[PDB]
Amino acid sequence: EHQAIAKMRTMIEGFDDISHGGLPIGRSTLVSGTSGTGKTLFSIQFLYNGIIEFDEPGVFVTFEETPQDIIKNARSFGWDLAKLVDEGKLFILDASPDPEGQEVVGGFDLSALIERINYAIQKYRARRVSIDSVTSVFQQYDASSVVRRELFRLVARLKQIGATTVMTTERIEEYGPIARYGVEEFVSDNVVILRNVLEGERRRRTLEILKLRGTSHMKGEYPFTITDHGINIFPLGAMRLTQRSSNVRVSSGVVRLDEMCGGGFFKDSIILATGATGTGKTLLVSRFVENACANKERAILFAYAESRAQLLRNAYSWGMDFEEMERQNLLKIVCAYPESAGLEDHLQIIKSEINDFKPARIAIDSLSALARGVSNNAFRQFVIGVTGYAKQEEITGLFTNTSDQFMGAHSITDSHISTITDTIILLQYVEIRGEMSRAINVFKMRGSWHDKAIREFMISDKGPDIKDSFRNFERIISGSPTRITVDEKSELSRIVRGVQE
């Protein structure tokens, strides 16, 4: 064919993007990785999606696990492969060693295997093939050079059958040799790397497509997650910056804050609320979610510092109630420690809830808690992920960032997120006459006017009460101001033009 390589859609969430179409049809694809990375799953989900979506028959070849365990373990994702075997759509070819014993099973055992596969293909008329762990076979007497020739024989014979094949290899070091015998990478037309990279004490699942002979593909490690729906990769780079926008205004919950912003927040905009600890970020978040519920809209709250009851207690002390909003089903709370997962996991925990409850407002309280030790690079990618998702879903997102230094915030966000967010709200402490006092301040708005005043504000049983500025103070930002006005008034005066010592 004069056409370039065509790809077959794996229908695995994300992989079709990173691979730019799927898998090169007619060729084999090497899915290599350390233990427990999701190799076996990738091969099964590939075959499974082949039957469900495109009615393409499949053949699975196992060398270690028993077909019973394959069907058993695949029930974790809700895949009745057994039925797919019954319907003649799926065929599991058992090639795992019988527990007894037989000498020399690497000679004509492979050449017979290839013809076993060919029969399995011809009989079931299968388009997709998965061969889990081709490593176990060569783990008998063979070494290096033996593997390369024998592996090439299987890749070659498979290609002539026209099978879109997916093979599997094991590893020892995360960033060491791509495959065991340091040879499989060069024989295979396609190479895919599954990593369970440590870093700290958490684990980050990454997928990389090393090479696709004949086509294009996204380069680098893209994070993924194994869930009850299977492999889920987030192409945080294929995300097209075409997110819609609107001049429709929504309320922050605080009336004056709507006026300080030139008619309330925008619907299609991300809101950041910085400031030291204790200023009142959680409160602005509370009042924010309160608005959507009152307008018969759905809204979610993600807390990463407070308990579920301490989030209701302090809220009830502000008069507002989340109970009734939960009772009438318009408000949803999550609450989870940042250490309970990695950033790759949390992103999906959010994203999943967004599809189920389908809110109109998102309030992630404390992004600063998701930078706890996590690299500044792995963080930005996550932030952009949430922001870049809530934007294309048209959801007003209010975020929160506790500044690590009270009184003297030389920079807005210490993790340099300030560029991504549209609307910025700055809260700060102002030492007035030996007293700490709040000072709400709208700092940026990308479509509206916006007030430019550094207004003080009190909080009580009602909370956010916005008063007047500090027109008689220098160096407000510093936190330790200075009274001016060297003039007086009222009645007077005389003249007596003289000194007068």
Ligand X SMILES: Nc1ncnc2c1ncn2[C@@H]1O[C@H](COP(=O)(O)OP(=O)(O)OP(=O)(O)O)[C@@H](O)[C@H]1O
Residue 51: both structure tokens together: 């039957």
Residue range at the interface with Mg ion (CB under 5 A); choices 38-46, 195-203, 234-242, 471-479:
38-46
Which residue's CB is nearer to ligand X, number 18 or number 395?
A: 18
Among 201, 296, 356, 501, binds a copy of itself (CB under 8 A): 201
Binding mask 123-142 for Mg ion (x = CB under 5 A): ---------xx---------
Q: How far apart are CA 259 and CA 264, in angstroms?
A: 6
Return the ∠ at Cα 97 (arms to 93 and 98), rounded to 5°: 105
* Residue carrying the six token digits 């294309």: 392
DSSP string, 333-377: E----GGGS-HHHHHHHHHHHHHHT--SEEEEE-SGGGGSSS-HH
Size of the site for ligand X (CB under 6 A): 45
The residues near 79 (Cβ < 8 Å, ≥ 6 apart) are 44, 48
Residue 1 interacts with which of Mg ion, ligand X, a copy of itself, none, CB < 5 to 8 Å by class: a copy of itself
Residue among 186, 248, 308, 431 that touches ligand X (CB under 6 A): 186
Question: Is 229 an interacting residue with respect to a copy of itself (CB under 8 A)?
Answer: no
DSSP track, 388-429? HHHHHTT-EEEEEEE-SSSS---SS-TT--TTT-SEEEE--E
- For residue 280, the partner it binds in ligand X, Mg ion, a copy of itself, none, with Cβ less than 5 to 8 A by kind, is ligand X
Q: Which is nearer to ligand X, 148 or 450 (CB)?
A: 450
Q: Which of 258, 297, 306, 326 touches a copy of itself by CB under 8 A? A: 306
Can residue 37 be called a binding residue for ligand X (CB under 6 A)? yes
Residue placing its CB nearer to a copy of itself in the complex, 328 or 480 = 480
Q: How far is the CB of 125 from a copy of itself (least distance, A)?
A: 23
Angle 83-87-91 from CA coordinates, rounded to 5°: 80
Q: Is the peptide bond before 130 cis (omega within 30 degrees of 0)?
A: no
180 interacts with Mg ion by CB under 5 A: no
Our finding on whether 171 is near Mg ion (CB under 5 A) is: no
495 binds a copy of itself (CB under 8 A): yes
**Which of 53, 76, 115, 123 is in the footprint of a copy of itself by CB under 8 A?**
76
Binder of ligand X out of 12, 23, 41, 121 (CB under 6 A): 41
CB of 264 to ligand X, least distance (A): 14
* Closer Cβ to a copy of itself, 56 or 243, answer by number: 243
For residue 461, give the amino acid letter: D
* 257 is a contact residue toward a copy of itself (CB under 8 A): no
Residue from 215, 243, 415, 478 that binds ligand X (CB under 6 A)? Answer: 215
Alpha carbons 39 and 37: distance in angstroms, whole number: 6
- Should residue 195 be labelled a site residue for ligand X when binding is judged by CB under 6 A? no
- Choose the contact partner of 283 out of ligand X, a copy of itself, Mg ion, none; CB within 5 to 8 A by kind: ligand X
Q: How many whole angstroms separate alpha carbon 430 and alpha carbon 411?
A: 17
Q: Nearest Cα to 128, choosing from 53, 32, 78, 215?
A: 53
AA identity, residue 343: L
Beta-sheet strands, E only, within 145-293: 164-170, 190-197, 204-212, 222-227, 230-233, 249-250, 265-266, 270-275
Answer for which of 66, 76, 144, 411 binds ligand X (CB under 6 A) is 76
The dihedral sign for the CA sequence 50, 52, 56, 62: positive
Binding mask 402-441 for a copy of itself (x = CB under 8 A): x-xxxxx-xxx---x-xxx-x-x------x-xxxxx---x
Partnered with residue 193 across adjacent β-strands are 32, 208
- Nearest approach, Cβ of 415 to ligand X (angstroms)? 16
Distance CA 129, CA 401 (A): 49
Structure tokens at 5: 């390589």
Is residue 215 near a copy of itself by the rule CB under 8 A? yes
From the list 170, 176, 179, 177, the residue with the least C-alpha distance to 148 is 179
> Does the footprint of a copy of itself cover residue 127 (CB under 8 A)?
no
Considering only residues 385 through 404, tell me which ones interact with a copy of itself, judged by CB under 8 A. Answer: 388, 391, 402, 404
Quick one: which of 88, 162, 263, 278 contacts a copy of itself (CB under 8 A)? 278
Tell me the C-alpha distance between 191 and 137, whole Å: 20
Q: Strand, helix or coil at 342?
A: coil
CA atoms of 189 and 131, how far apart (whole Å): 15
Binding site for Mg ion (CB under 5 A): 39-40, 132-133, 281-282
Q: Which residues of the chain form contacts with ligand X (CB under 6 A)? A: 35-41, 76, 133, 170, 186, 211-217, 226-228, 277-283, 305, 314, 317-318, 366, 402, 419, 444-450, 459-461
